Amino acid sequence: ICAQKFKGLTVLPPLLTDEMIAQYTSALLAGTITSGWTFGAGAALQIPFA
Amino acid sequence: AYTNSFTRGVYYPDKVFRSSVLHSTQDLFLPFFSNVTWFHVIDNPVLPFNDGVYFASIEKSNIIRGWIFGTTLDSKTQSLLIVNNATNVVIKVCEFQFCNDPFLDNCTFEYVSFKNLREFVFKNIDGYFKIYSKHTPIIVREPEDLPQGFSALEPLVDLPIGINITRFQTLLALHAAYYVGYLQPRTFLLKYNENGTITDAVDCALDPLSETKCT
Amino acid sequence: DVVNHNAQALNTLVKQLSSKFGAISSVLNDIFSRLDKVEAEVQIDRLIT
Amino acid sequence: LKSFTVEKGIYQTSNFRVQPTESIVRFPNITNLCPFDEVFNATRFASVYAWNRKRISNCVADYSVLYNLAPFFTFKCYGVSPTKLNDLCFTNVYADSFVIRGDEVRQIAPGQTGNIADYNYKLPDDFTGCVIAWNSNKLDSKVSGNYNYLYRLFRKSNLKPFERDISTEIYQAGNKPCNGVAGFNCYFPLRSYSFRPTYGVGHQPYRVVVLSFELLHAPATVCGPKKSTNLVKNKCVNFNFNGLKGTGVLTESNKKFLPFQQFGRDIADTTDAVRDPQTLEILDITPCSFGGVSVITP
Amino acid sequence: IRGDEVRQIAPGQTGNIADYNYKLPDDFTGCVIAWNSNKLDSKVSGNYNY
Ligand SMILES: *[C@@H]1O[C@H](CO)[C@@H](O[C@@H]2O[C@H](CO)[C@@H](O)[C@H](O)[C@H]2NC(C)=O)[C@H](O)[C@H]1NC(C)=O
Ligand SMILES: *[C@@H]1O[C@H](CO)[C@@H](O)[C@H](O)[C@H]1NC(C)=O
Ligand SMILES: *[C@@H]1O[C@H](CO)[C@@H](O)[C@H](O)[C@H]1NC(C)=O
Ligand SMILES: *[C@@H]1O[C@H](CO)[C@@H](O)[C@H](O)[C@H]1NC(C)=O
Ligand SMILES: *[C@@H]1O[C@H](CO)[C@@H](O)[C@H](O)[C@H]1NC(C)=O
Numbered sequence A: 001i002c003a004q005k006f007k008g009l010t011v012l013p014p015l016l017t018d019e020m021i022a023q024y025t026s027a028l029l030a031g032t033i034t035s036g037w038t039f040g041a042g043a044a045l046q047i048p049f050a
Numbered sequence B: 001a002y003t004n005s006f007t008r009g010v011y012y013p014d015k016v017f018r019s020s021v022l023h024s025t026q027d028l029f030l031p032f033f034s035n036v037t038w039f040h041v042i043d044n045p046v047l048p049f050n051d052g053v054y055f056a057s058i059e060k061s062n063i064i065r066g067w068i069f070g071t072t073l074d075s076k077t078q079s080l081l082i083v084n085n086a087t088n089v090v091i092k093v094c095e096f097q098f099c100n101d102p103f104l105d106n107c108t109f110e111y112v113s114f115k116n117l118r119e120f121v122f123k124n125i126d127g128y129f130k131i132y133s134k135h136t137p138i139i140v141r142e143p144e145d146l147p148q149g150f151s152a153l154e155p156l157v158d159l160p161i162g163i164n165i166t167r168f169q170t171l172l173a174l175h176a177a178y179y180v181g182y183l184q185p186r187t188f189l190l191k192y193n194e195n196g197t198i199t200d201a202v203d204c205a206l207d208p209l210s211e212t213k214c215t
Numbered sequence C: 001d002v003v004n005h006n007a008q009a010l011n012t013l014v015k016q017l018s019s020k021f022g023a024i025s026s027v028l029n030d031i032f033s034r035l036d037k038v039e040a041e042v043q044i045d046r047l048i049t
Numbered sequence D: 001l002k003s004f005t006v007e008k009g010i011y012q013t014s015n016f017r018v019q020p021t022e023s024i025v026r027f028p029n030i031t032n033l034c035p036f037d038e039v040f041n042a043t044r045f046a047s048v049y050a051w052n053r054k055r056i057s058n059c060v061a062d063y064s065v066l067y068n069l070a071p072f073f074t075f076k077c078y079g080v081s082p083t084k085l086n087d088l089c090f091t092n093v094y095a096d097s098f099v100i101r102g103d104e105v106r107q108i109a110p111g112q113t114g115n116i117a118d119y120n121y122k123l124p125d126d127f128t129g130c131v132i133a134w135n136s137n138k139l140d141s142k143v144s145g146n147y148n149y150l151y152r153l154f155r156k157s158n159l160k161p162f163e164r165d166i167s168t169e170i171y172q173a174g175n176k177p178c179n180g181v182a183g184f185n186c187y188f189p190l191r192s193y194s195f196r197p198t199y200g201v202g203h204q205p206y207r208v209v210v211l212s213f214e215l216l217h218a219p220a221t222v223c224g225p226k227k228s229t230n231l232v233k234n235k236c237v238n239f240n241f242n243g244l245k246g247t248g249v250l251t252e253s254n255k256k257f258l259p260f261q262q263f264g265r266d267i268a269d270t271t272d273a274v275r276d277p278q279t280l281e282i283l284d285i286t287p288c289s290f291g292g293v294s295v296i297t298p
Numbered sequence E: 001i002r003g004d005e006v007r008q009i010a011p012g013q014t015g016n017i018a019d020y021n022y023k024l025p026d027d028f029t030g031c032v033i034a035w036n037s038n039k040l041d042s043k044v045s046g047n048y049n050y
């Protein structure tokens, strides 16, 4: 990495970090479990999982 | 008498420090598992030089003192003579045979400067005689066969003699065995470690597995 | 493979500098120190291209 | 952006680089002027098969004296530039000083073909050096010819480069055996041109000196006249190590160099570690500090 | 010009002539014409005017 860094070759960091990606996936999975298909169409509507 | 060459014949092709790298080179190397001639000191026949000689000597009393090179070797043309008497190294290009010493065996350039295994590579390229040397303490139970292992030969001597050399002959101390192998133009893959020492080499012209390794 | 395709490409792009591209050397400081500018531009145009 | 109005966002601009502060020149401390007088200003120049290879090492080769030398004029060079010849360091220099016919002076060059270039003195194709010639008709040409210089017009094979052949035995020019007896198709090999001042300018004798350099990754013994400065570490400086120029930071390193090794190379085959020629110390070369610059604007 | 120093009359050249009395630029676009002086300048027992 340092040998290619000395040659003008660099790597920019991503805008979204892994914590923010995990927060997105946690929000999606929590909304899916607690509301089903409703939070993809509008406001999340609670419903029992059975 | 013949025996196996094993993985010997690896020398540094350049004087550049490289560390932790697989470097591919193309030079006159000794091929892996080639078939080296074995002589035992009782025996110094005249041998052809080809394009290079790997000379290995297993000794403890230093019976071999040097070599004589040349084409005709009968005071008709140039003849390189290298003698070491454990004090000074004498390198001459004199045409005279001069086979007189305490031990039984024009000058345009003169240069004065079983527990032991001495490995040498002699090659004559573009009028330059290159001598590569290595010495190691190894104890072997039988000197009938060449010892198995890997060794790197550091460059020692470069001479601008410019002499056509086709035959050579070793010299003995009289009042211990040696092996002769011939070099071939080969592509090699050398592994420079953290120390910069060539710890392993792959001959690209040995088998399809090593050809795949080189590609 | 997404990791390796970028790592191998960067390693190859580093390894392209050792190519001479028909010039006498791959070191531009060596070319400038060992030649005049008139043929040094000719030797260095190949490396640049 | 090549515009006078700039929209909002982040725009990448030109990079920043730390410029060098000082300049370091470091050469080995050889203080002996090089004996070019023994090669050029010699009273007698040897023959072709008197292959006198003068070895030059541990010199300070000032080429201005050779350039302003009275007899020798032509200064042809292959591989190096003559104006740069006072700025480089060579491991060893080899000089060959002969007298040759002026017709075959053009044969003293790589890739040439002729009697001289085949059987007398052949240069390799990768020859990096210089050829110097003077029309020696005023001195090396005598009345009724000078027979000290010998030429072998016929031989078994061409010579390999930088080799000599002083054998005086009779070569069988024809297919018939000769048995060491001179005669038809059994001529003496070493003939002569017998240079005279009355000859034509093409056939006049010429004193030629060929200087062959050795530009390797080896310790240097011959160096041009240049004054070495002090060593500055841990600072972005320009440097000149034995004719190797660069710009960077020289740091102390723990690299275990072999005693025959001088320079170190990385994966990209650039110089990464050098050996200081005065005091045997290993120095790592790091490029100076840099990076990208971005402009965040509304 | 001294005949050995005539070869300095070119861009990018060093020597006494180019360093101390007459230097050509590196962007030079023109012509150089050389003719042997012989009897015109070099005379018996030398000429001191150069
Ligand atoms: C170096 O010596 C060898 C040995 O004599 C030369 O090989 C001979 O070359 C001639 C010329 O064609 C042949 O007729 C012979 O058959 C070759 N072999 C022998 C054993 O004589 C070789 O040419 C020499 N090389 C140089 C550059 O002089
Ligand atoms: C070497 O050659 C001999 C024949 O002279 C043969 O018997 C022997 O097997 C060969 N050894 C190798 C390793 O090829
Ligand atoms: C070895 O040879 C050199 C050169 O001939 C000579 O000076 C020296 O005395 C010799 N040493 C012995 C121990 O014979
Ligand atoms: C030594 O070289 C010269 C070269 O001119 C030659 O005449 C002489 O015969 C050579 N010596 C011997 C013993 O052959
Ligand atoms: C060489 O190897 C030894 C042990 O393997 C190590 O201590 C030393 O630092 C190495 N030299 C280098 C990396 O220059």
Ligand SMILES: *[C@@H]1O[C@H](CO)[C@@H](O)[C@H](O)[C@H]1NC(C)=O
Residues within 6 Å of the ligand: D029, D277, D278, D279, D280
């Ligand atoms: C000259 O170089 C030698 C080589 O090691 C060194 O020991 C010595 O100190 C140097 N002398 C000066 C004055 O730099």
